[PDB]
Write an enzyme that holds these catalytic residues in place. Sequence first.
Site, PDB file in Angstrom:
ATOM      1  CB  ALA A   1      -0.948   0.012   1.210  1.00  0.00           C
TER       2      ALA A   1
ATOM      3  N   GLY B   1      -0.974   2.807  -4.901  1.00  0.00           N
ATOM      4  CA  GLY B   1      -2.271   2.415  -4.368  1.00  0.00           C
ATOM      5  C   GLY B   1      -2.128   1.199  -3.478  1.00  0.00           C
ATOM      6  CE  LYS B   2      -6.146  -2.934  -1.232  1.00  0.00           C
ATOM      7  NZ  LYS B   2      -6.995  -4.126  -0.894  1.00  0.00           N
TER       8      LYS B   2
ATOM      9  CG  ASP C   1       8.369   7.930  -6.592  1.00  0.00           C
ATOM     10  OD1 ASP C   1       9.098   8.282  -5.613  1.00  0.00           O
ATOM     11  OD2 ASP C   1       7.233   7.396  -6.501  1.00  0.00           O
TER      12      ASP C   1
ATOM     13  NE  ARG D   1       9.193   6.275  -2.178  1.00  0.00           N
ATOM     14  CZ  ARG D   1      10.043   7.246  -1.853  1.00  0.00           C
ATOM     15  NH1 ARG D   1      10.850   7.108  -0.819  1.00  0.00           N
ATOM     16  NH2 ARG D   1      10.081   8.358  -2.555  1.00  0.00           N
ATOM     17  CG  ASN D   2       9.041   3.591  -6.033  1.00  0.00           C
ATOM     18  OD1 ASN D   2       8.060   3.078  -5.490  1.00  0.00           O
ATOM     19  ND2 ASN D   2       9.243   4.891  -6.078  1.00  0.00           N
TER      20      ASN D   2
ATOM     21  CG  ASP E   1       5.194   1.706  -7.378  1.00  0.00           C
ATOM     22  OD1 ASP E   1       4.786   0.686  -7.972  1.00  0.00           O
ATOM     23  OD2 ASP E   1       5.073   1.871  -6.135  1.00  0.00           O
TER      24      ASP E   1
END
Length: 288
Positions: free
Chosen positions: A32, A34-35, A151, A155-156, A169
Amino acid sequence: NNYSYIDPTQLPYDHKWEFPRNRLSFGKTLGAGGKVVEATAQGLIKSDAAMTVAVKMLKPSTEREALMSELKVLSYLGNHENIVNLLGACTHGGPTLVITEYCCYGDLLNFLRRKRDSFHNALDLEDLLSFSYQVAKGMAFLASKNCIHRDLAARNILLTHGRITKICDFGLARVIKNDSNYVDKARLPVKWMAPESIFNSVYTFESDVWSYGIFLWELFSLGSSPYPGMPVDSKFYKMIKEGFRMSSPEHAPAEMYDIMKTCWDADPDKRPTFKQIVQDIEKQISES
Ligand SMILES: c1ccc(-c2cc3cc(-c4cn[nH]c4)cnc3[nH]2)cc1
């Protein structure tokens, strides 16, 4: 002028990717942010077997389009070893879904965090070099197709079988064929953004490289948060504009830190290219 480079990300959705939702069975929630949820997909194989996939969805409006954006970008880029693979999409009777490759280890940030004590199925310097190398290659590929991710962060980045890193992402990704800049008019990754992006809202190939620098810092610090303990306030923006930069993380080889420093030059033109970065890291790896 009346003469334009056609932007493939602005063309209509190509229904080559369409997939019947009847042939998806939803499993666990995967993230999450979006998810995304794990699922099994019928008919993606010529032999007609079921396979595990990751499906990106929304909850019941700018994020509505960001998903369509991400899908057209992935469709445009094609397949690469270092990008999360697009497998299909559902756009008919129901909510819009994006089916993509499942990465069994998930994000690289929490992977480095889980593995922080085991460091030195353990982790060592050669893995972090490899992560350096692969992510720069994936980025060099995007730059080759006039695409900026906007981005770039740990985390991506997903890690799959074989310790292969995949960039994911693409919600904020843009294709910058026509103009050499991109100016935005949402919520943003301040601690990963170049100054010109914060101060003047411009995004370029050079601003992605800046993010790549911050990513390395995440990487060689084994998943530590950038500018630790520094809240995003006025004090932060000045220090950035005056030229202050994070120091070398604990496990970063000196020549890998030199790369971060040049990614963080206030002058975008003095920053390196991903092509150059991939060459640098490759030579560092050879000397071993
Ligand atoms: C344990 C926990 C979580 C995972 C996991 C997250 C994840 C996210 C995507 C994703 C697709 N698009 N954007 C992101 C794909 N596979 C994933 N796998 C694996 C093991």
